[PDB]
């Protein structure tokens with residue numbers, strides 16, 4: 217159950233990091 | 249501990265999933 | 281290992297909440 221958790225958390229971290237760069241690019245273009 | 253972690257991780261996966269769909273829509277809009 | 285996981289999931293939860301906040305703001309600014 218835990219080794220399974222570590223995998224998933226690791227995948228989540230990568231997805232969250234990608235969302236972090238898309239979101240920074242968006243905020244910069246949108247401004248306001 | 250572990251059941252707690254599994255509930256949390258499931259909930260994150262669905263939230264990341266939702267973030268990913270909103271951000272794809274926003275990139276398409278802002279990117280025109 | 282479980283305690284490092286718990287902190288990893290805690291940090292992800294915080295990050296997901298902030299991204300949800302920013303994406304909601306951006307949606308409002310971009311419109312429909």
Ligand SMILES: *C(=O)c1ccc(NC(C)=O)cc1
Pocket residue numbers: 217218219220221
């Ligand atoms: C949890 O991730 C987990 C559960 C059961 C086992 N069983 C093995 C490999 O014996 C591993 C990991």
Ligand SMILES: *C(=O)c1ccc(NC(C)=O)cc1
Pocket residue numbers: 230231233234235237238
């Ligand atoms: C940027 O979006 C970015 C760059 C590298 C990674 N790394 C992995 C392993 O996904 C994530 C996000």
Ligand SMILES: *C(=O)c1ccc(NC(C)=O)cc1
Pocket residue numbers: 249250251252253
């Ligand atoms: C983990 O979330 C966890 C830890 C302990 C228990 N209950 C018992 C009886 O150990 C449930 C869940």
Ligand SMILES: *C(=O)c1ccc(NC(C)=O)cc1
Pocket residue numbers: none
């Ligand atoms: C998001 O990936 C998502 C949500 C719903 C569906 N399909 C239906 C029938 O709801 C596909 C994909």
Ligand SMILES: *C(=O)c1ccc(NC(C)=O)cc1
Pocket residue numbers: 281282283284285
């Ligand atoms: C896993 O996160 C983990 C395992 C052991 C310890 N602490 C000691 C003293 O072994 C911390 C964290």
